[PDB]
Design an enzyme around this catalytic site. Sequence first.
Site, mmCIF file in Angstrom:
data_model
loop_
_atom_site.group_PDB
_atom_site.id
_atom_site.type_symbol
_atom_site.label_atom_id
_atom_site.label_comp_id
_atom_site.label_asym_id
_atom_site.label_seq_id
_atom_site.Cartn_x
_atom_site.Cartn_y
_atom_site.Cartn_z
ATOM 1 N N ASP A 1 13.327 -1.528 19.696
ATOM 2 C CA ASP A 1 12.162 -0.943 20.221
ATOM 3 C C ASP A 1 11.448 -1.534 19.456
ATOM 4 O O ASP A 1 9.765 -1.156 20.384
ATOM 5 C CB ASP A 1 12.411 0.731 19.782
ATOM 6 C CG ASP A 1 13.516 1.816 20.906
ATOM 7 O OD1 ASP A 1 13.822 1.286 22.010
ATOM 8 O OD2 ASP A 1 14.534 1.987 20.466
ATOM 9 N N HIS B 1 13.665 4.026 29.062
ATOM 10 C CA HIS B 1 13.979 2.436 28.858
ATOM 11 C C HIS B 1 14.763 1.845 30.110
ATOM 12 O O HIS B 1 16.293 2.065 30.269
ATOM 13 C CB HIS B 1 14.301 2.023 27.714
ATOM 14 C CG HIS B 1 13.264 2.744 26.575
ATOM 15 N ND1 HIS B 1 13.955 2.685 25.384
ATOM 16 C CD2 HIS B 1 12.258 3.328 25.994
ATOM 17 C CE1 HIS B 1 13.187 3.072 24.328
ATOM 18 N NE2 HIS B 1 12.486 3.630 25.185
ATOM 19 N N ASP C 1 16.499 -0.700 29.242
ATOM 20 C CA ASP C 1 18.022 -1.668 28.582
ATOM 21 C C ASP C 1 18.525 -0.006 29.137
ATOM 22 O O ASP C 1 19.908 -0.629 28.326
ATOM 23 C CB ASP C 1 16.900 -1.803 27.458
ATOM 24 C CG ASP C 1 17.306 -0.642 26.242
ATOM 25 O OD1 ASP C 1 16.906 0.345 26.285
ATOM 26 O OD2 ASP C 1 17.232 -1.491 25.457
ATOM 27 N N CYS D 1 22.055 2.378 15.821
ATOM 28 C CA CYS D 1 21.841 1.208 15.479
ATOM 29 C C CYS D 1 20.870 0.885 16.614
ATOM 30 O O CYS D 1 20.380 1.562 17.371
ATOM 31 C CB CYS D 1 23.051 0.579 15.121
ATOM 32 S SG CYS D 1 23.569 1.505 14.308
#
Lengths: 653, 653
Positions: free
Chosen positions: A343, A456, A458, A632
């Site tokens: 991020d 996001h 992603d 993570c």
Amino acid sequence: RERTVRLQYGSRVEAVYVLGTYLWTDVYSAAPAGAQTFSLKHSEHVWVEVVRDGEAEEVATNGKQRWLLSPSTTLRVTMSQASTEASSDKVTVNYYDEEGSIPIDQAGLFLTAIEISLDVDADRDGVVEKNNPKKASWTWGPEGQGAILLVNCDRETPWLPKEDCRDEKVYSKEDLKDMSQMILRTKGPDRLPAGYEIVLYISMSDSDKVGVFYVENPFFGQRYIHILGRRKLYHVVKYTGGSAELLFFVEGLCFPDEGFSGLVSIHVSLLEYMAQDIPLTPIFTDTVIFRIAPWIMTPNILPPVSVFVCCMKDNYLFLKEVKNLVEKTNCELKVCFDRWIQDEIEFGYIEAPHKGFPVVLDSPRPVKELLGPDFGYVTREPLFESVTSLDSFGNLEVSPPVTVNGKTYPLGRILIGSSFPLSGGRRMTKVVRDFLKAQQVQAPVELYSDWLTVGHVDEFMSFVPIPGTKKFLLLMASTSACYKLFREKQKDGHGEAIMFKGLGGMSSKRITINKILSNESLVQENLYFQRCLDWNRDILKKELGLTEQDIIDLPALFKMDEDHRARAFFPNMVNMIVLDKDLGIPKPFGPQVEEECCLEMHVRGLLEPLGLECTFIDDISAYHKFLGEVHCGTNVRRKPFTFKWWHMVPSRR
Amino acid sequence: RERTVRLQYGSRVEAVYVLGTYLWTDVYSAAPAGAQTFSLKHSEHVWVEVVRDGEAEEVATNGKQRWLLSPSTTLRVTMSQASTEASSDKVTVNYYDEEGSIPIDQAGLFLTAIEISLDVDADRDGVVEKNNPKKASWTWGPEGQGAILLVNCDRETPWLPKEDCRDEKVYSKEDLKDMSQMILRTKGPDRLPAGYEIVLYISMSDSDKVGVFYVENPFFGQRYIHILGRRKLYHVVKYTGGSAELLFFVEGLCFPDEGFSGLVSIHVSLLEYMAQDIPLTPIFTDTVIFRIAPWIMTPNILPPVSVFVCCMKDNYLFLKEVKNLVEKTNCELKVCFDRWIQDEIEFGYIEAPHKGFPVVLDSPRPVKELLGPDFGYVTREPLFESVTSLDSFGNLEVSPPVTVNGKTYPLGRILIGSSFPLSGGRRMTKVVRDFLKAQQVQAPVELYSDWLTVGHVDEFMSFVPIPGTKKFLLLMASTSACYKLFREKQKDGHGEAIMFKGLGGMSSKRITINKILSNESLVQENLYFQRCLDWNRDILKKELGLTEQDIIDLPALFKMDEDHRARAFFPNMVNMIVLDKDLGIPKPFGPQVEEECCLEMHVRGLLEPLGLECTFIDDISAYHKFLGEVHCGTNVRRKPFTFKWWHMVPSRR
Ligand SMILES: [Ca+2]
Ligand SMILES: [Ca+2]
Ligand SMILES: [Ca+2]
Ligand SMILES: [Ca+2]
Ligand SMILES: [Ca+2]
Ligand SMILES: [Ca+2]
Ligand SMILES: [Ca+2]
Ligand SMILES: [Ca+2]
Ligand SMILES: [Ca+2]
Ligand SMILES: [Ca+2]
């Protein structure tokens, strides 16, 4: 270039002549009143033409020829070689009246010829050519020309915190390797004539875009002098005679941005002293232009170099499985002991003919701790606008190279998530969007991410290379794929198969395929999320030039929040570590059928026939439950594109 | 454009289809678990292909054909005509299991096809074509495309002081003639299906660049509704069925400038209502772009229309002689009863395919009193930077069309006076320079004016057409020409000839040729001023592509002030009224030889052989003396260039 130098009534004129120009010379104003004709003599290395109303005639060194005096009869004076101490370069004009052939007066021109050229590597081979005729312009493309400058954003030595370009000093000779060379080449006699000086200069505007250093080698060792840059707009050059070169090193301070195109100029002028209190006259000026290299992003099709990973020290399964994955490759694994590496940072690069290195973009507020030798840093801070989740770099990705209706994007296109224009929803800050747009070579496209709680791109899409080919696939999250699979397994007698097996904090929930399929509101939510996914699918197909053959749908499922935004029901498999053929895929914890996850088996069935190798990576077991959040992060630093950015021809802005 | 529409497990899907797109349709997700094959039916005006892994096959309206169910087997759905009330447009898919040929389930798609196109005159003929495929782009040049917008900067009615574009209202239908037409063309049934609306919109950024009006004809007469613009970013369109058009009129509010390229966009979207609190989905979007026309200056080679003159009511000789001059032409004379008409205003123009008119640029602080119907107004105010004499428009001029090293400037190049880069001297304010640069089509060049006390390029240079040709001359002030002439007349026995004869306030000075030529310091000053003139000559030759054959030198003489700056010794003849072949030239009051001014005779000798007719205009006799200042001003308003600005291809910025 033609330059005006008049003979003077009475006094002889002394002038400096710069090679590559020529003089047009008025001999009439200097002639006594009533004079009729003139004749001339000149020295060996001065070429003289008499130009009568546009018609030019070459004249010998000593002839006796006479011409009628007339304002339209002038001299053109040319020199092909610089003066030395052995030079007397001159032209002398004699005036005559109607009575008699003896001169009644004489007007001289005494010349000192010098060469002055400010040279850069315009042809982009890394070497500085002599006076490239295109050096004052910058053109894009394979046949394009003009010199390139890096923002020198890395840091040579650890002692000072800031990037190299933040000051006016150079500590280490290694810094010069990041810099573009510029050579002031001169040729002339022992000294300039009285009243002249050579000066390098830049505009006030460009003074925060560049810095320019000269290397001295005094007694006690090499030193670096800042001659142009912040709060120094000009430098008076020390002239050395004969054939001389002064080598300078140029750094960029600033990336292209809103209001800065990336182009900067440096000038040299020969100045003539007129008198006290009178500005010096710019007799000759030579200019070079630089373009500052843009920041460029690397898509998943590019070779991996280093895998950066952040997690807690005790997430053992994650660490073990990521290590296993990376061991199948030549990549370095780098671990920092919670999503910040994905991020807060985006690994880009910059390149010039002489040098290139990676550059981190830092998301708006310890990532500055990556700043180091040939690892650069850049950031943008909104001054006013508030930061949201859409400013995190999970929302910043880039496509592989694509061709869209005949328009090539050889570096791919940056993709950032947004909201619909009339929605009043979230959008990445203007300051970052303007920065990405200004780099120009990645032609950014906004997708729709604001249907997601985190927001996001992603979360819903990724790209993977197809092994053994030059091609790639778009991977899309699909709720319809998940419902289809679950309904099949239910029909097959598996409805009581449980999700999240092994996560003890979820056990009391007893989530099965049956429980999921029976949840009516959840079905409606996910139909809506599929509409959101499909809207993106369409814009991706349009803006990337993709067809259905280029897309694979991975099963996904979401839960809706109070804002009618989506969060993952089970880990999003689309956001995966792509190292060429090897894919680290978040472990979904799907329903077990015959002691294998049906989601894992389904995904393998899609990917494996293409030569992709799947490793499922468990980042959640250490937390005993999955709430929709990932603890993570990973970020892969990749090799730059082979295609040089300066060979692109971006659309006119 | 391909758009994703999936069949839905259970419920039939109803969708709007926009002509010019097509649908890719997933039939697999809607199929019951365990279903084997599918068949389909469709209506007459719906075209359906079954696409198996990229291979497409056309399918009849009612066949019995079955295909294996598979995520890679999909439908492509196309419609060529809009729905009417007589339409039932549909595709129906039947599902089958392995046992038996009777359908086990059915999933429908019910379509309503509509045409939606936002149209503008992109091909620049003044008429709005149907859906120009290039309407969303703007390209320069003869083959270029995209629609053009005027800043609507004139004022239709006198009652309100401000220019038309300063508000959100239209009072007069005449205003619409200044505006570009944009038509939203639709075709469809009586109403949109439930849950849809059509919306026009613009960005916040563009909201101060445009305004958009729609004309209503209610009972009591025509009214003008502002639907997009300042503080209105969107408008919900009232849909009418059948084949319908909505005509809109678009005005520009702002000229191109620093930070605004001139390009603006308008969009229409078909929006779908999802639910309360959920943003509406943009099902289809169509976009048009406009470029706002630049402000353009007219060089002296362009046909004169009106001669604007300012002087005192009692300067009779000036008025008489200017009237005489203008009477030789077809020009209008306009008199206002002291240099303001030349210093405060520059007459430019704007042009679009549909309309064009003149526009005054007002120099930085009663010129707003020129604002009127088809006479527009624009100004720039420095927010911070202080105004100097170099901001007056005697310092703002423009060259005739020129070609420079193969680069054509069909509108000429703007010329503004400045100081040397390192001089610390005066320069026109950045705000005006940025404005002129942003117009782009006149590619401005800075000359050196700061050697003059007043500091205006019109003090030293002008352009005149050469009668009977397509060519022009540059006229330059020359002190060397003046000294040559005076020295000749002295030699001829005229040294005692007096300047300023008839100006009674100068009589006691008794200035003769002898007195001028004997003044040693004045000689040195004027040699220096000739260097200044020659520096300009060189930059003009370079930047305009001129040779010595293109230049005539007019005698001039200056006195130096405490700042080492020049003011005219006698009136500057170069700043002249150019009406084609007829030149009003300031009367110099030079030395009388045989009862004629030798300066007048010399100037006639230069100009008359070229077919130029010279009239000397006395503006100083009414003041009894000449101190270096001119008390009158003139400004000629000219016809625009025949060459359309949009046919130029300016260099990339
Ligand atoms: Ca080179
Ligand atoms: Ca430094
Ligand atoms: Ca460095
Ligand atoms: Ca370095
Ligand atoms: Ca990213
Ligand atoms: Ca048209
Ligand atoms: Ca108005
Ligand atoms: Ca108007
Ligand atoms: Ca009008
Ligand atoms: Ca002017």
